[PDB]
Design a protein around this nucleic acid. Structure first.
Length: 71
DNA sequence: ACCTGCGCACCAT
DNA sequence: ATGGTGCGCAGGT
């Protein structure tokens, strides 16, 4: 889908907005419920966003989080 | 189960 | 100091 990048970035923003860690599990869970795709597909799309440096994967306070690079 | 809301301690700069 | 972050809950669907 052409909207997948926006789906993931909006999900990261929404998890930050409710003060929840944007980890892989919550990102995949929210994309599935909002839009349909299975976690395997969201994992693959997220990896593309990391290679494009649109999303940053960081370790923070002992766990991995994903950051919207535009923010 | 599912979801959102949030105070404030924590962390890099 | 700044100014973003998310634990550990409360509370609703």
């Amino acid at each position: 889908s052409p909207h997948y990048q926006e789906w993931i970035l909006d999900t990261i923003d929404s998890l930050r907005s409710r003060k929840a860690r944007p980890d892989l599990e919550r990102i995949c869970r929210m994309v599935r419920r909002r839009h349909g795709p299975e976690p395997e597909r969201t994992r693959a799309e997220l990896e593309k966003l990391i290679q494009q440096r649109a999303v940053l994967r960081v370790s923070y306070k002992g766990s991995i989080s994903y950051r919207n690079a535009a923010r």
